[PDB]
Amino acid sequence: PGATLCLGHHAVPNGTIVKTITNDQIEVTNATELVQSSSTGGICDSPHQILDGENCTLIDALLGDPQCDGFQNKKWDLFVERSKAYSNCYPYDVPDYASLRSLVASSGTLEFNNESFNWAGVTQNGTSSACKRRSNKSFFSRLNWLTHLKYKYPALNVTMPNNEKFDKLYIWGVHHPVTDSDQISLYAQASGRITVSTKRSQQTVIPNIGFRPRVRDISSRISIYWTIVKPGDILLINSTGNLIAPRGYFKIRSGKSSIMRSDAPIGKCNSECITPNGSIPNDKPFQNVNRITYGACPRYVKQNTLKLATGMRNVPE
Amino acid sequence: PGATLCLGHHAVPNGTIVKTITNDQIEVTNATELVQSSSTGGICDSPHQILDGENCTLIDALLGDPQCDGFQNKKWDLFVERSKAYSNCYPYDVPDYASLRSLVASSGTLEFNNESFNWAGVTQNGTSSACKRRSNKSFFSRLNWLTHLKYKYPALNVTMPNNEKFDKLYIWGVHHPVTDSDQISLYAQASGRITVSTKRSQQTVIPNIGFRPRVRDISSRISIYWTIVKPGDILLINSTGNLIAPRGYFKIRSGKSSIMRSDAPIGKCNSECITPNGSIPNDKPFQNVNRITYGACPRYVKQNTLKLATGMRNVPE
Amino acid sequence: PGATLCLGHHAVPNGTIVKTITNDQIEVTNATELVQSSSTGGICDSPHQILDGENCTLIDALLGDPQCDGFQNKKWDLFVERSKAYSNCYPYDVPDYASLRSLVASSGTLEFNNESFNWAGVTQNGTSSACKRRSNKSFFSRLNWLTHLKYKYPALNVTMPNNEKFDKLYIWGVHHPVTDSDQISLYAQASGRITVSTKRSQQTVIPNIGFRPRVRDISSRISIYWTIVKPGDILLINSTGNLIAPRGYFKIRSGKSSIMRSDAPIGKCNSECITPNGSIPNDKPFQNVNRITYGACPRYVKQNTLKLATGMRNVPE
Ligand SMILES: *[C@@H]1O[C@H](CO)[C@@H](O[C@@H]2O[C@H](CO)[C@@H](O[C@@H]3O[C@H](CO[C@H]4O[C@H](CO)[C@@H](O)[C@H](O)[C@@H]4O)[C@@H](O)[C@H](O[C@H]4O[C@H](CO)[C@@H](O)[C@H](O)[C@@H]4O)[C@@H]3O)[C@H](O)[C@H]2NC(C)=O)[C@H](O)[C@H]1NC(C)=O
Ligand SMILES: *[C@@H]1O[C@H](CO)[C@@H](O[C@@H]2O[C@H](CO)[C@@H](O[C@@H]3O[C@H](CO[C@H]4O[C@H](CO)[C@@H](O)[C@H](O)[C@@H]4O)[C@@H](O)[C@H](O[C@H]4O[C@H](CO)[C@@H](O)[C@H](O)[C@@H]4O)[C@@H]3O)[C@H](O)[C@H]2NC(C)=O)[C@H](O)[C@H]1NC(C)=O
Ligand SMILES: *[C@@H]1O[C@H](CO)[C@@H](O[C@@H]2O[C@H](CO)[C@@H](O[C@@H]3O[C@H](CO[C@H]4O[C@H](CO)[C@@H](O)[C@H](O)[C@@H]4O)[C@@H](O)[C@H](O[C@H]4O[C@H](CO)[C@@H](O)[C@H](O)[C@@H]4O)[C@@H]3O)[C@H](O)[C@H]2NC(C)=O)[C@H](O)[C@H]1NC(C)=O
Ligand SMILES: *[C@@H]1O[C@H](CO)[C@@H](O[C@@H]2O[C@H](CO)[C@@H](O[C@@H]3O[C@H](CO)[C@@H](O)[C@H](O)[C@@H]3O)[C@H](O)[C@H]2NC(C)=O)[C@H](O)[C@H]1NC(C)=O
Ligand SMILES: *[C@@H]1O[C@H](CO)[C@@H](O[C@@H]2O[C@H](CO)[C@@H](O[C@@H]3O[C@H](CO)[C@@H](O)[C@H](O)[C@@H]3O)[C@H](O)[C@H]2NC(C)=O)[C@H](O)[C@H]1NC(C)=O
Ligand SMILES: *[C@@H]1O[C@H](CO)[C@@H](O[C@@H]2O[C@H](CO)[C@@H](O[C@@H]3O[C@H](CO)[C@@H](O)[C@H](O)[C@@H]3O)[C@H](O)[C@H]2NC(C)=O)[C@H](O)[C@H]1NC(C)=O
Ligand SMILES: *[C@@H]1O[C@H](CO)[C@@H](O[C@@H]2O[C@H](CO)[C@@H](O[C@@H]3O[C@H](CO)[C@@H](O)[C@H](O)[C@@H]3O)[C@H](O)[C@H]2NC(C)=O)[C@H](O)[C@H]1NC(C)=O
Ligand SMILES: *[C@@H]1O[C@H](CO)[C@@H](O[C@@H]2O[C@H](CO)[C@@H](O[C@@H]3O[C@H](CO)[C@@H](O)[C@H](O)[C@@H]3O)[C@H](O)[C@H]2NC(C)=O)[C@H](O)[C@H]1NC(C)=O
Ligand SMILES: *[C@@H]1O[C@H](CO)[C@@H](O[C@@H]2O[C@H](CO)[C@@H](O[C@@H]3O[C@H](CO)[C@@H](O)[C@H](O)[C@@H]3O)[C@H](O)[C@H]2NC(C)=O)[C@H](O)[C@H]1NC(C)=O
Ligand SMILES: *[C@@H]1O[C@H](CO)[C@@H](O[C@@H]2O[C@H](CO)[C@@H](O)[C@H](O)[C@H]2NC(C)=O)[C@H](O)[C@H]1NC(C)=O
Ligand SMILES: *[C@@H]1O[C@H](CO)[C@@H](O[C@@H]2O[C@H](CO)[C@@H](O)[C@H](O)[C@H]2NC(C)=O)[C@H](O)[C@H]1NC(C)=O
Ligand SMILES: *[C@@H]1O[C@H](CO)[C@@H](O[C@@H]2O[C@H](CO)[C@@H](O)[C@H](O)[C@H]2NC(C)=O)[C@H](O)[C@H]1NC(C)=O
Ligand SMILES: *[C@@H]1O[C@H](CO)[C@@H](O)[C@H](O)[C@H]1NC(C)=O
Ligand SMILES: *[C@@H]1O[C@H](CO)[C@@H](O)[C@H](O)[C@H]1NC(C)=O
Ligand SMILES: *[C@@H]1O[C@H](CO)[C@@H](O)[C@H](O)[C@H]1NC(C)=O
Ligand SMILES: *[C@@H]1O[C@H](CO)[C@@H](O)[C@H](O)[C@H]1NC(C)=O
Ligand SMILES: *[C@@H]1O[C@H](CO)[C@@H](O)[C@H](O)[C@H]1NC(C)=O
Ligand SMILES: *[C@@H]1O[C@H](CO)[C@@H](O)[C@H](O)[C@H]1NC(C)=O
The missing domain is CATH 2.10.77.10 (Hemagglutinin Chain A, Domain 2)
Structure with a gap:
């Protein structure tokens, strides 16, 4: 078998x-x-450091919009920008907005250091009803709206050396008044011109007087610019009007930080x-x-x- | 065996x-x-909607060059631009030409809607011998060359709201005269300045008087700009001279449309x-x-x- | 068995x-x-044609900085830029520096041809103590600093046709004086404006008077621009002051040339x-x-x- x-x-x-x-x-x-x-469906708050922008865009938190005072000096791995975010200060634009947003996002910090700029002979700390804090007229926290002092605005020619070991990011602006009479009532002369320079770079901006559509009841505008100042270099601001002055500088770091647009809720998870x-x-x-x-x-x-x-x-x- | x-x-x-x-x-x-x-060796006319530019670049068909009147309100899947195409109107340039060409190509339509701009106190419909239709002096069909009325050009401060459900594309320009006397004979004042704005954007352009080499016997130039106006936003044009005004807006769509440079003949095939x-x-x-x-x-x-x-x-x- | x-x-x-x-x-x-x-560890000098920039950036060799006279009319496959390189002439910037550097690097030649521009009624060949050759005051070799002649600067309106078979690259600049009195002492009028055009392009630049930080003891600046002129086209320069004039054109070729940043020594090897x-x-x-x-x-x-x-x-x- x-x-x-x-x-x-x-x-x-x-x-x-x-x-x-x-x-x-x-x-x-x-x-x-x-x-x-x-x-x-949610963004886990660990192990990356998440910063929920809530009502604030990154740029509004940078400039210091009244709804963004809680963001001062904060750091992030990922800044989360919400679709509902809106501005509640003076209407502004940023030529190259996308680049400023990117470079701040990538740096991952809003660390700000005040500096003592000698704004000789002008009125400082201008405010507006389009930018309220607690119903008081106010302005962007990191910017200084300079105006005439006793109907004079002497030329500004102001220096700030970088004697640090790191780069400094300066944010500043130009005010575009609605009319020639507004120009005179704010700055005591018919136009302005702003030149911001370093040893290696220069930017000059001309204010452009005229009407834009009203936003939060304002027909003027501010245009925002920035300047990076390397160790050993010197910031020079030379202007005769219309300067929205820096109050100091932001630290600029390199690392793994970024920004993301999302409406997903942040959860306690990893x-x-x-x-x-x-x-x-x-x-x-x-x-x-x-x-x-x-x-x-x-x-x-x-x-x-x-x-x-x-x-x-x-x-x- | x-x-x-x-x-x-x-x-x-x-x-x-x-x-x-x-x-x-x-x-x-x-x-x-x-x-x-x-x-x-040929471009089949099916199944994509082909638009042969013949003598016209896309931008000439947009502005309304005299040889391109047949293109009004046409749509395409693929706009075919020929190497022989040439302009036969007032000499112009477009800062960012490549971008305007791209965005119109991608939109895939020249659909145009006229609007009633209130150009109070100026002469409308200026024409030139460099831009003939049927030997008559003419101009770009979609643009309106404004000049002085009885040796005055009062400031323009003109609004056009977008109360549609779609975005509007506005094309407009600035005229650069050859000389100071030309500036005065056209606009009755020594210079111009043009600010075109919305709630979210602003563009100001300065005319620059001077000689450029003659093209179709003209040493002046027009520079072409554009502005997109979202639903609920408002176009504001504020100018004191040198404005080449829009007559209306183009529709801007999204889809599968593009543009191609080719000299291949179009055939009846699929x-x-x-x-x-x-x-x-x-x-x-x-x-x-x-x-x-x-x-x-x-x-x-x-x-x-x-x-x-x-x-x-x-x-x- | x-x-x-x-x-x-x-x-x-x-x-x-x-x-x-x-x-x-x-x-x-x-x-x-x-x-x-x-x-x-070294860059072999064969079989590619290597050009060691030594103390010169490509752009300094282009403009004709005093340390770069040895580079005139040289060609390369690979231009090697050293980290120690520094400028020793009038402080300048180049809007779009990266693009001018790229396009010259890619062209692979500094071949320069002088041309006879008719600069009627002005003083030519201006020099400066910030740009010495052999302790003599000097200037960029390829540029011509024009100033007033007997306290007049009549308008320039100068043409240079391209009757060659190839494209011409023109490098030119605008001088930004430190002060209004400097502006007058150099150019005999309160400001300038420069328009450089061809049949197909136009660039206008406005000088911006003001202080920048001192570099090699100079607080003014020069801004460098360029213009390509095709066969049959014509360069037109129209200016009333502040023009840093071209002396001629560079040849522009296409081919396999490039530029590299390296501190590696060049050796005799393949x-x-x-x-x-x-x-x-x-x-x-x-x-x-x-x-x-x-x-x-x-x-x-x-x-x-x-x-x-x-x-x-x-x-x-
Ligand atoms: C079909 O084929 C697949 C692939 O071979 C098999 O899937 C594997 O099954 C084994 C045994 O169940 C899994 O081993 C277990 O993995 C767990 C970790 O999970 C990792 O990967 C999964 C992917 O889904 C993720 O959820 C997670 O993030 C991890 O990255 C361990 O925790 C398990 O440990 C358990 O046993 C060990 C034994 O030492 C103990 O230490 C613990 O107490 C614990 O209880 C375990 O190792 C393996 O992950 C599976 N791989 C994949 C790719 O899914 C299927 O089993 C097979 N099916 C059939 C029917 O044969
Ligand atoms: C070497 O190997 C190759 C690959 O296997 C073989 O090529 C195939 O040959 C068969 C039989 O001739 C082909 O089948 C026929 O395809 C036609 C459609 O063509 C498609 O692909 C070709 C690619 O060249 C394109 O021209 C065309 O756009 C199509 O996408 C059909 O129309 C034919 O239909 C005929 O027979 C059917 C039977 O039901 C009837 O319905 C019709 O009446 C009609 O007469 C047919 O199906 C196949 O396409 C070939 N493939 C490729 C990739 O070329 C070679 O045959 C083989 N050579 C040798 C010597 O063995
Ligand atoms: C393990 O496996 C590898 C891959 O098969 C073997 O490596 C090859 O070994 C052979 C024999 O030594 C090599 O042949 C020789 O190549 C030389 C040219 O080198 C080329 O490639 C090397 C890569 O390292 C580069 O250095 C060089 O730039 C070249 O591109 C020739 O010059 C040699 O010529 C000699 O013999 C011929 C015979 O006709 C004569 O003309 C000359 O007189 C001369 O003396 C020779 O042809 C081959 O290059 C190796 N290939 C690689 C990829 O390295 C190992 O041998 C094998 N090891 C073991 C232990 O089995
Ligand atoms: C130039 O044109 C612009 C745009 O048409 C004019 O702006 C408009 O100005 C009027 C009058 O100040 C504004 O009206 C105000 O509206 C608010 C909000 O409802 C209201 O609270 C005020 O009481 C007042 O009615 C209007 O908002 C504004 N429109 C836009 C779009 O900005 C401007 O007046 C013109 N300038 C001149 C000199 O004519
Ligand atoms: C760059 O900074 C300098 C330094 O402050 C500015 O130059 C100075 O500008 C002021 C005001 O324009 C000048 O004063 C004026 O002089 C005229 C001439 O007599 C007089 O009529 C006016 O009443 C006034 O006093 C000052 O002379 C001038 N200083 C120098 C050294 O030139 C310049 O304005 C700044 N640039 C910018 C863009 O802000
Ligand atoms: C500034 O420089 C430009 C360039 O050299 C001068 O433009 C030239 O002006 C002349 C005189 O009007 C033009 O001549 C004309 O040519 C046409 C075409 O052949 C002919 O039909 C006319 O009868 C006349 O001869 C010439 O075309 C033009 N050249 C260029 C390149 O545009 C301009 O005149 C100068 N301005 C001053 C104020 O000197
Ligand atoms: C933006 O739009 C406004 C509103 O039309 C323009 O402002 C207006 O400009 C005109 C002409 O420049 C001003 O009239 C002039 O007033 C002077 C001062 O007395 C007088 O000497 C002239 O004969 C003429 O009448 C008008 O006052 C002014 N309106 C306001 C409210 O300021 C402005 O020009 C526009 N901006 C641009 C860039 O076009
Ligand atoms: C506007 O502000 C700038 C920046 O503060 C002033 O520039 C500075 O001007 C002084 C006086 O000319 C320069 O001093 C010189 O330094 C050199 C090098 O050590 C030395 O050899 C000279 O004897 C002199 O001491 C200084 O370098 C310069 N600083 C910078 C950063 O450029 C400018 O003077 C101000 N303008 C007005 C009208 O106030
Ligand atoms: C473009 O080139 C033209 C041609 O040279 C320049 O136009 C000319 O500019 C000069 C000086 O600005 C004018 O002369 C002046 O005329 C006035 C008016 O009477 C007089 O008061 C002055 O004393 C001087 O003589 C000249 O008339 C003018 N020519 C023409 C045909 O308009 C123009 O300046 C150049 N543009 C640039 C940006 O450089
Ligand atoms: C994650 O979010 C993306 C982005 O919104 C979703 O992709 C979109 O899906 C809708 C349909 O729900 C499409 O109309 C869009 O074309 C998609 N957008 C893009 C940018 O591609 C995606 O469905 C979501 N995925 C999951 C798993 O939730
Ligand atoms: C299709 O057109 C392309 C573009 O002109 C042809 O590619 C060129 O061929 C010539 C030689 O005839 C070369 O000198 C160029 O370098 C090629 N141009 C590019 C941009 O690569 C191509 O030969 C054509 N192909 C067919 C099958 O007709
Ligand atoms: C060749 O040079 C590169 C560039 O400097 C070297 O890469 C760097 O290596 C250092 C460590 O020595 C790192 O800190 C940098 O992140 C690297 N730089 C970049 C740009 O990636 C590389 O090590 C060198 N390789 C060899 C074989 O010599
Ligand atoms: C954000 O704004 C909304 C109103 O637009 C308000 O209800 C909410 O309290 C704000 N959130 C924060 C965190 O301030
Ligand atoms: C401006 O405001 C700050 C507080 O934000 C204050 O320290 C400073 O004294 C003010 N300066 C002037 C000139 O009002
Ligand atoms: C295109 O232009 C040429 C002359 O340059 C002319 O012969 C032809 O008729 C024109 N084509 C059309 C469609 O108008
Ligand atoms: C301008 O021309 C159009 C026709 O293109 C005409 O409807 C309009 O009445 C003209 N307007 C003026 C002010 O001449
Ligand atoms: C380059 O500059 C250094 C000083 O910075 C000098 O020692 C050297 O001789 C220069 N090299 C050349 C090739 O001129
Ligand atoms: C300018 O300098 C060159 C030499 O570089 C010389 O040929 C020319 O004659 C000079 N021209 C004037 C006007 O000084």
Whole structure:
């Protein structure tokens, strides 16, 4: 009689369909998903330092809009900007806004140091009803609106050396009055011109008098500029009117900081990978949640699912 | 005696040489080409909506050059710009020309709506011998050259609200006269200044009087600018001279539209993939016709040919 | 008794560890390194034409700084800029500096042709103590500082046609005086304005009078601009003061030329691939020396080492 000895392999009743080089649909005993397609819906507050902008854009927190005083000197790994954020100060624009936003986001700090600028012969600390704190007329916290003193505005020619070991970021502005009579009532002369320079750079800006549409009841504008001053260099401000003066400088650092637009709530939890949709697990190599990511994240791909076989071909009985 | 039974495989007299991981030249029984290397030489007019610019650049058709009146309100999937195209109106430049061209190309429409701007106290509809229609002096169809009325040009301070559900694109310009006497004869005052603003943006432009080389016998210039006005925002134009005024707005859409430089003829045929060389079949995954493509196109690669084996190794008798 | 016949394969005592799809560490009999991780430390002077900038930036050699007279009309495949390089002429800036540097680097030539500009009614060849040659006051070699003649500066309205078969690059500038009295003592009128145009382009620049920090004892500045003039086009310079005039044009070529920042010494040797660290062998497909490369170079990758098996699995006795 003898015996029979059969060689074989396992199978399962419930196999999984995968793709190969030669077949778009072949059943294997087991597979694992390589694309992360879901988020928790919230941004975990750990392990990255998250700063929720709430009502404030980064630039409003920089300039010191009345709703953003809580942000002074704060640092972040990720600044989260909300779609509802709105400005509540004097109407302004920033030529190159995207660049200033980027460079501050990347620096990751609003650390500010006051400096004693000698604004000889002018009135300091100008305020406006378009920028209230506690119903008092106010202004951007980090800027100094200079105006005439006893109907004179003598030329400014003011220096601030950088004797630090680090770079300084200066934010400053030019005021564009609505009319020629406004120009005279504020600055006591028919126009201005502002030149801000260092040993290696120069910027001159001309105020442009005229009407813009009313925003928070103001038809004038402020235009915001910035200047970086290296160790051993010197800031020189030379102006005859219309200067929205710096009060000091911001520290500028380098590191891993960034900014993200999201309306996702911040939660008490721990996740390395942040998207605008919320944090996502990062076990998988790929994800199709969002191209926008921050941290140790799977790579964004177009596919919904990619199944990696983890077993043999399934050949059921 | 018994029998002999031989196992074997086919071969062909005429095999094809392919590349593998271990051999740059191995003969197989059959192969297929994966790189499309030829075009028909013409651009098929289907299934994309093709607009042949003929003598007109997109920007000339936008502004309304005399040779481009046939283009009014036309739409396209692909605007085809010809190398022979030339301007036949007042000499102009567009700071950022590439961006205006891109944004209009991408929008895919020249749909224009006239609006009633109140140009109180000036002469409208200025014309020039450098921009003829039917030998009559004329001007860009979408722009309004304003000049003095009875040797006065009172300040303009004109508003146009956007109460639509869509964005409006405004095209406007500044006239740079050749001389101080030209400035006075056109605008009745020594210079101009133009500020165009919205609630969220502002542009001011200064005319610059002086000689440029003659183009179509004109040594002055026009510089072209644009402004996008969102729903609920308001256009404000404030100027004292030198304004080349808008007559209305263009619709701005988003979609699949673009622009291509080509001298290929347009034919009555159907092809999904367009290159400057002409339409190409899109059965193959790769092509080496042109990096510039539009539609469902193979991907551009450097290789002339890539042969995919579709049979076994060929081992002839 | 009979015989025994055993089939087998070789092995070595000293195998090499490689990575595969299924194992990060498997021993093979032999392998070869695919990542170049070392340089010689010097830049080989062959086979590319190397131009060592020594104390000169490319832009200083272009303008004709006193330390850069040896560079006149030189050509390069690779211009090497040293970190110690410094300027020793009148303090200047170049709006778009990076672009002018790039376009000259890419052109690969400082070939300069003088032209006879008719500067009727002004003093030519102005010099300064901030730009010495042999202790004599001097100026940038390729620029012409125009000033008043007998306390007059009549308007300039000067033409230079391009009747060549090639494009011309013109470099020119605007002088920004420190004070209103300086403006008058140099140019005999209260301000300037410079318009440089062609048939297809226009640039106007306004001088901006004021103090900048002293650099080589000068608080004024020069701002440098450029203009390309095509065959058949015409350069037109129209100015009333503050013009730092061109003396001629540079040739502009296209080809394989570039620029690199490096402090590596130049040696007498032959290597196709240049990095800032020095030349590297290019036998391997990859390298981790520097992302910055010039010539026939391996591709930059993050890995230190990638070992390609060149033998079987090593199974020692
Ligand atoms: C089909 O094939 C897949 C892939 O091989 C198998 O999935 C693995 O299953 C094993 C055994 O259950 C898993 O091992 C466990 O992993 C946990 C950590 O999870 C990591 O990866 C997952 C991915 O989903 C993430 O959730 C997470 O962030 C981690 O990165 C460990 O915590 C587990 O530990 C447990 O056992 C150990 C034994 O020492 C103890 O220390 C602990 O007490 C603990 O209880 C465990 O190691 C493995 O993660 C799975 N891999 C993947 C990729 O999912 C399936 O099991 C297989 N299915 C079938 C039916 O055969
Ligand atoms: C060497 O190997 C290649 C690849 O396997 C073989 O090429 C295939 O040959 C078959 C049979 O001739 C082709 O099948 C036919 O395809 C036509 C559609 O063409 C598509 O792909 C080509 C690519 O060149 C494009 O021109 C075109 O845009 C399409 O995307 C069909 O129209 C044909 O239909 C005919 O038969 C069917 C049968 O039902 C009928 O419905 C119709 O009446 C009609 O007459 C047909 O299906 C196939 O396209 C080829 N593939 C490729 C990639 O070229 C070679 O045959 C082989 N050579 C040898 C000697 O063995
Ligand atoms: C482990 O596996 C590797 C890869 O197979 C083997 O390395 C090869 O070894 C052979 C024989 O020594 C080498 O052949 C020689 O190449 C020289 C040119 O070098 C090129 O590549 C190297 C890469 O390091 C560069 O240095 C160089 O820039 C070149 O691009 C030739 O000059 C040699 O010529 C000599 O022999 C010929 C015979 O005709 C004569 O003409 C000359 O007189 C001359 O003396 C020779 O051809 C080959 O380059 C190596 N390849 C690589 C990638 O390194 C190892 O040998 C093997 N190790 C073991 C223990 O088996
Ligand atoms: C130049 O044109 C602009 C735009 O048309 C004019 O601005 C408008 O000025 C009026 C009058 O001051 C403003 O009216 C005010 O509206 C507020 C808000 O409702 C109200 O509280 C005030 O009592 C007053 O009615 C109007 O808001 C403003 N419009 C815009 C769009 O800014 C400007 O007056 C013109 N200048 C001249 C000199 O004519
Ligand atoms: C750059 O800073 C300097 C230094 O303050 C400014 O120059 C100074 O400007 C003032 C006011 O414009 C000048 O005073 C005026 O002089 C005229 C001439 O007699 C007189 O009529 C006026 O009543 C007034 O006194 C002053 O002379 C001048 N100083 C120098 C050294 O030139 C300059 O304005 C600043 N630039 C900018 C853009 O702000
Ligand atoms: C400032 O310089 C420019 C450039 O040299 C001068 O422009 C030139 O002006 C002359 C005289 O009007 C133009 O001549 C005309 O040429 C046309 C075409 O052949 C002809 O039909 C007319 O009868 C006349 O001869 C010339 O085209 C023009 N050149 C350029 C390059 O634009 C300008 O006159 C100078 N301004 C002053 C105030 O000197
Ligand atoms: C922005 O729009 C406003 C409103 O039209 C413009 O302001 C107005 O400009 C005119 C002409 O410059 C001023 O009239 C002039 O007043 C002087 C002073 O007495 C007089 O000598 C002249 O004969 C003439 O009548 C008008 O007062 C002024 N209105 C206001 C409210 O300031 C302004 O020019 C526009 N800006 C631009 C850049 O166009
Ligand atoms: C406007 O402000 C600037 C910046 O504070 C003033 O520039 C400074 O001017 C002084 C006086 O000319 C310069 O002093 C000189 O220093 C050199 C080098 O040590 C020395 O050789 C001279 O004998 C003299 O002491 C100083 O360098 C310069 N500072 C800077 C940073 O540029 C300018 O004077 C002010 N203008 C007015 C009208 O007040
Ligand atoms: C562009 O080039 C033209 C041609 O040279 C310049 O125009 C000319 O400018 C001069 C000086 O500004 C004018 O002469 C002046 O005329 C007035 C008016 O009577 C007189 O008071 C002065 O004493 C002087 O003679 C000349 O008339 C004028 N020519 C023309 C045809 O307008 C213009 O300045 C140049 N533009 C630039 C930005 O440099
Ligand atoms: C995460 O957020 C993104 C961005 O909003 C979502 O992608 C959008 O999905 C909508 C449909 O819900 C589409 O209309 C848009 O085209 C998508 N936007 C972009 C920018 O691609 C995405 O669905 C979200 N994913 C998850 C898993 O929540
Ligand atoms: C399609 O058009 C392109 C662009 O003109 C052709 O590519 C050029 O070919 C010429 C030689 O005829 C070269 O001198 C240029 O360097 C190429 N230009 C570019 C931008 O790469 C191409 O040959 C055409 N292809 C076909 C199949 O017609
Ligand atoms: C070649 O030069 C590069 C650039 O300086 C070197 O890369 C730097 O290495 C230092 C450490 O020595 C790091 O701190 C920097 O982050 C690196 N710089 C950049 C820009 O990546 C590199 O080490 C040199 N390689 C060799 C083989 O000499
Ligand atoms: C943000 O603004 C809204 C009103 O727009 C207000 O209800 C809310 O209290 C503000 N949040 C903070 C944190 O100030
Ligand atoms: C301006 O305000 C600050 C407080 O913000 C104060 O320290 C300073 O004395 C004020 N200066 C003047 C001139 O009013
Ligand atoms: C285009 O211009 C040429 C002359 O340059 C003319 O022959 C042709 O008729 C024009 N085409 C159209 C469509 O107007
Ligand atoms: C300007 O021209 C248009 C026709 O293009 C006409 O409707 C309008 O009445 C003209 N306006 C004036 C003020 O001449
Ligand atoms: C470069 O400058 C240094 C001083 O800064 C000098 O020692 C050296 O001789 C200069 N080199 C050349 C080539 O002129
Ligand atoms: C300017 O200098 C050059 C030499 O660099 C000389 O040829 C020319 O004659 C000088 N011109 C004047 C007007 O001084």
